[PDB]
Amino acid sequence: IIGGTESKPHSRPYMAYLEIVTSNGPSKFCGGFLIRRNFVLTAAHCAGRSITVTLGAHNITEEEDTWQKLEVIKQFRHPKYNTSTLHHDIMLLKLKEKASLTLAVGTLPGRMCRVAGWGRTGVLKPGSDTLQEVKLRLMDPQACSHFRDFDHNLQLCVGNPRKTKSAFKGDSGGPLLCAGVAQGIVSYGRSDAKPPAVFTRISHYRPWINQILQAN
Ligand SMILES: Cc1c(S(=O)(=O)Nc2ccc(-c3ccncc3)cc2C(F)(F)F)sc2ccc(F)cc12
Numbered sequence: 116i117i118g119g120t121e122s123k124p125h126s127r128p129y130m131a132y133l134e135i136v137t138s139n140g141p142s143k144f145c146g147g148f149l150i151r152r153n154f155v156l157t158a159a160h161c162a163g164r165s166i167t168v169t170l171g172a173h174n175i176t177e178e179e180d181t182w183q184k185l186e187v188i189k190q191f192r193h194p195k196y197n198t199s200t201l202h203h204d205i206m207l208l209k210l211k212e213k214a215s216l217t218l219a220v221g222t223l224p225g226r227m228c229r230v231a232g233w234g235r236t237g238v239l240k241p242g243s244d245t246l247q248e249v250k251l252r253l254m255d256p257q258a259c260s261h262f263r264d265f266d267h268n269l270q271l272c273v274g275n276p277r278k279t280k281s282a283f284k285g286d287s288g289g290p291l292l293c294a295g296v297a298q299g300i301v302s303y304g305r306s307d308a309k310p311p312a313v314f315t316r317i318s319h320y321r322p323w324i325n326q327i328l329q330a331n
Pocket residue numbers: 160199200201262263264281282283284285286287301302303304305306308312313
């Protein structure tokens with residue numbers, strides 16, 4: 116998160132910190148959010164060989180009783196996910212067991228929405244130890260035209276280009292909440308962090324989400 120504030124600790128109890136393993140490189144990291152006690156929603160580009168989910172975190176470097184480290188038993192990447200266009204950048208993670216409900220852990224184009232994450236706080240900066248959040252402007256789709264594979268039906272265009280405020284690397288998979296309702300998932304943007312960024316429009320995938328949740 117660039118240009119944001121430190122979240123009040125545990126004020127977003129649905130937030131998930133994802134550590135993603137691949138065979139041929141070190142761990143990568145993403146955000147996500149708990150939508151059922153045993154399901155986390157995130158971005159498809161956060162898929163890997165295996166994933167660990169930490170719920171209940173604020174400072175991800177300091178173990179505390181709110182933490183629930185949970186095994187993912189299966190990844191459900193959207194079947195039409197495209198690695199070139201990044202269309203359908205959405206994935207459900209089924210947890211081995213249902214998370215415990217605690218205070219710190221529970222389930223979840225001109226308006227202002229909020230996104231949170233542990234991602235980088237600048238181009239040359241590292242992932243944040245603490246959960247950060249930022250208020251961003253929903254933009255008209257023409258603001259994202261320069262993303263040649265942007266699609267207004269599939270995606271949201273998020274972040275006033277006049278501001279430095281943005282989701283960034285490591286925030287992938289985190290929710291965009293507009294008046295308390297999750298409308299988007301951090302997907303991609305520019306390497307140089309110039310907003311706007313592209314978010315998955317969750318509404319488009321409600322049928323698919325429902326099918327996975329009902330059948331698993
Ligand atoms: C994650 C991300 C990055 S990245 O550089 O780490 N990855 C990336 C960037 C651009 C595309 C892309 C470019 C054209 N058409 C489609 C996709 C795809 C990728 C993919 F897949 F690797 F994640 S920059 C940024 C900025 C804001 C934000 F919120 C998220 C990100």
